[model samples]
Target: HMVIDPSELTFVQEIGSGQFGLVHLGYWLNKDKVAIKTIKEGSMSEDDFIEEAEVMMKLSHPKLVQLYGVCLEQAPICLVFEFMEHGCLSDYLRTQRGLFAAETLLGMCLDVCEGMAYLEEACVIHRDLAARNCLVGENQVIKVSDFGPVKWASPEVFSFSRYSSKSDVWSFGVLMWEVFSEGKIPYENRSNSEVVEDISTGFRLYKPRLASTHVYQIMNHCWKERPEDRPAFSRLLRQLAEIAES
Candidate 1:
């Protein structure tokens, strides 16, 4: 909803890459640190893109990354967002492997579920949910950010390109694997077509060594072939809450 002047931002360093373009760590008005997402051409048209940003700005949740504003004057339209200290969850999991307790890992999963539940209630389908799209802020808090991929997608996705909240649930399950496995890539060393073949054969990713039988069972349910059979984000949140407590 807010359009900022490009002069107000001082680009610090390249922090990460988004689906559209590069994400940078920058200072806003010489004081506030923020993350700026630069959108490349052909991603989306100007009016529609700005409209989508307006929608995102209306969505406010503790577990969801905040969209501060945008810069339309820039060549690559920029989206200013809240700066997360620890960056993306995938890299965080890899770097801090073996450093987190089981409870801490469960907490991370709960955070994402809470965010997803909000999206579900808001009637929004994330379309992309993965460790790579989640961010870790201070105090080990997690905030769902820009959302991808064949590996994390459900059968409905890669096949018919169909998307829904149910498909997001499937992706969340894969993200849980990434968390428990400490960032091991899903379907490791397998090509995309091979992964597709495996899924077609009803093969699921093996349970992470760190996941208990109960934890794995939840993930198993998320991979159900029929999208209608998959649990809602609210249901998943409840299941994870139970596990987190016991």
Candidate 2:
């Protein structure tokens, strides 16, 4: 396990609040600019936290944000990750709306699908997948981050609290919607209960004005009621790759 000595880190400034606690733009050994996320105590026991950290350290892919190490020998355990230049995808899309061409947006989705396909093959489920959970990098690249909430969750996650790769796929479909629509929140006007009821009755997000017919069809396939019916990330990758190359 990569255990980071606390003294080796220098907090520069608070970047943002993550699912855990305040994320800071910090430096490791006063050299590399890194993002340090302080985990809220009581969120998980030390053992559980360390175990998850070990698991996280094993995951490596170009499209997934790299977990550098952890500050485990103290209170408010800190997780250090490689800093992303452009921050979260949701905010990037919102801030740069209409600046991205259709192909650029599709490439972003393809990048996510590539990383997710790797996770699927590794037997890992992201649990939470959304544009907000993905970070933008140089040249419009995106790297999957680690988190999720109701608005971007699938029916199974919201209903039974079940999460799987297929559920991740469902979330990816919504994420694709977000990318195409320039980061508009899903069901922005509807309550969670209302969204749940609507989904239960076969209602799905309407095609974003920017989503082409092909793209909308892919999103529809991902929303199939049965988890088994959803396309695997590998399959989604293939489809998206074809679309991107066309």
Identify the leading candidate in terms of lDDT.
1
Worst 10 residues of 1 by lDDT: 1-10
Query: Each prediction's Cα RMSD?
Result: 2.0, 1.9
**What is the per-residue lDDT of model 2 for residues 1-246, given as tens digits with 9 covering 90 to 100?**
765666688899998874667899999988988999887767668887788888788888899889878887786798899899899999999999989888899999998998999899889999878898899887889999883177667777888999899999999999999999998989999998888888889999989887888988999888988899999999999998887765
lDDT of 1 at 85: 92
**Model 2 weakest 10-residue run by lDDT:** 147-156
Number of the top TM-score candidate: 2
Please, what are the lDDT tens digits per residue for candidate 1 over residues 59-171?
88899998778888757798888799998999999999989787888899999999999998898889889998899999989999863179988998998999999999999
Each prediction's TM-score against the native? 0.92, 0.93
TM-score of 1: 0.92
User: What C-alpha lDDT values do all the predictions have?
Assistant: 0.88, 0.87
Residue 117 miss distance in model 1 (angstroms): 0.9
